Amino acid sequence: MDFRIGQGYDVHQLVPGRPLIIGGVTIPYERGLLGHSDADVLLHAITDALFGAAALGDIGRHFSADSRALLRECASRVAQAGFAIRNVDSTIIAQAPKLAPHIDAMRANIAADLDLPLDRVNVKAKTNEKLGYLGRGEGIEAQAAALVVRE
Amino acid sequence: MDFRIGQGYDVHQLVPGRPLIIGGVTIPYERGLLGHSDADVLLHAITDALFGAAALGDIGRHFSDTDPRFKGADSRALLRECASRVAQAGFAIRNVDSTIIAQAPKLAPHIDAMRANIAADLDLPLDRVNVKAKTNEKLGYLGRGEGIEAQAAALVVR
Amino acid sequence: MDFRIGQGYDVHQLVPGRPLIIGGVTIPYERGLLGHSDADVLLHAITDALFGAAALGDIGRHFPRFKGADSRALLRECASRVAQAGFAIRNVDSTIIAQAPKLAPHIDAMRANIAADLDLPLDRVNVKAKTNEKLGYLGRGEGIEAQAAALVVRE
């Protein structure tokens, strides 16, 4: 079968006076992510992995905003290109806040947006062990991998 | 044909007074990795990729400070336990690939031993396990030798 | 069937005085990448992902007969070794992280070079671009990073 893999990366700065939204979950926090749309770093990384697996370019090609609506439209285009999504895995790298209590809700949001069962979606969290701009809490990064199959 | 992919990331600080252990191999060096267990950044990244591919969460969700089974366990015991939980969930491991990013020391003479260790721990043939090494071209905290990063990718099938 | 995955990473410093070559494409810019070969960070990452999927070690283990060889030559040789190991390449995806210059205009050219070198249909090759949102050495324009993923199948 015609399997394809995709990978994605995103990072945004953390700034005061923005809500913190990751994987579609609003997380109580004194800072939020700054950037394109609601700056949901995890959903953007996943979106890039899916477009990448389908060889449809990247998120900026498609979407010159609720990042869940963008993920759903990404999933629609990937399906229209003839691909079915098989699984998604991902990592969020953040010094803070603690993400564990929110991870299951993120997984559920992604699963809903991709029309996948929960057991085909995974979200992992890491600190950066105090190193670099991530260790200093200046931003949050997300990484994603996706497997799709054509037809 | 129910294939799944997983990806893993880890980084630890390099500190004096600790052995450098990567892929289960003790490498001569004036500093070693600081962290959970023996801070084996490569085995941790692989562990997370495998949990990821099986949609089992992550290393921190499985292995706590609170668990007497894993108190002071080295990263190879954890990797073996990861493999156990992946099998328990109905998955077989097909291959692992990885990259260690370290400005220093030279990892080349140690790579095949790392591969051998991982293959043994995962019950895989050598030809389904790969480890690569990169410097960071003196950029950032990696380039300054403040820490070492590892990245991993894993394919499994249910 | 006998699928395998691979992943690749590369980074090079960005300095005045060298041409900027990414994915085989010369891109007009005041600065260029410094490093192994012609420092094509994207082709190097892809090469590493392919050797990784085939469990053949890494680019430095493979590449004397290669002094002065440019990265497309290296990619092509990589592709040959992957095939002789029994693997057919199914797809490649990748991301370039560069604060500047704008890479979008050059993406099709990169994809075309990579697909040619790998003997792949164009629709099995993808290249994405990201800024680093002004964070870190990448965000300050001190270097450019590439990440790659490759899927292969034995026979």
Ligand SMILES: Nc1ccn([C@@H]2O[C@H](CNC(=O)c3cnc4sccn34)[C@@H](O)[C@H]2O)c(=O)n1
């Ligand atoms: N050096 C760079 C860096 C980036 N890009 C492109 O610049 C574009 C920027 N990315 C977005 O627009 C974006 C990210 N997240 C969201 S949600 C709605 C749009 N977006 C992408 O196409 C990149 O390919 C580029 O051409 N060159």
Ligand SMILES: Nc1ccn([C@@H]2O[C@H](CNC(=O)c3cnc4sccn34)[C@@H](O)[C@H]2O)c(=O)n1
């Ligand atoms: N911002 C963050 C960052 C991390 N974590 C969680 O924090 C957890 C932490 N990590 C481990 O215990 C760990 C890493 N390596 C080893 S070996 C034995 C345990 N471990 C992970 O579950 C993360 O999901 C979190 O909840 N929020």
Ligand SMILES: Nc1ccn([C@@H]2O[C@H](CNC(=O)c3cnc4sccn34)[C@@H](O)[C@H]2O)c(=O)n1
């Ligand atoms: N800490 C490190 C870091 C790297 N390496 C090895 O050092 C080697 C360095 N990488 C290259 O030679 C290289 C990268 N891009 C090109 S084009 C022609 C050669 N190359 C790799 O084999 C790594 O395994 C190592 O042994 N120890």
Ligand SMILES: [K+]
């Ligand atoms: K990184």
Ligand SMILES: [Zn+2]
């Ligand atoms: Zn984003």
Ligand SMILES: [Zn+2]
């Ligand atoms: Zn670790």
Ligand SMILES: [Zn+2]
């Ligand atoms: Zn390079």
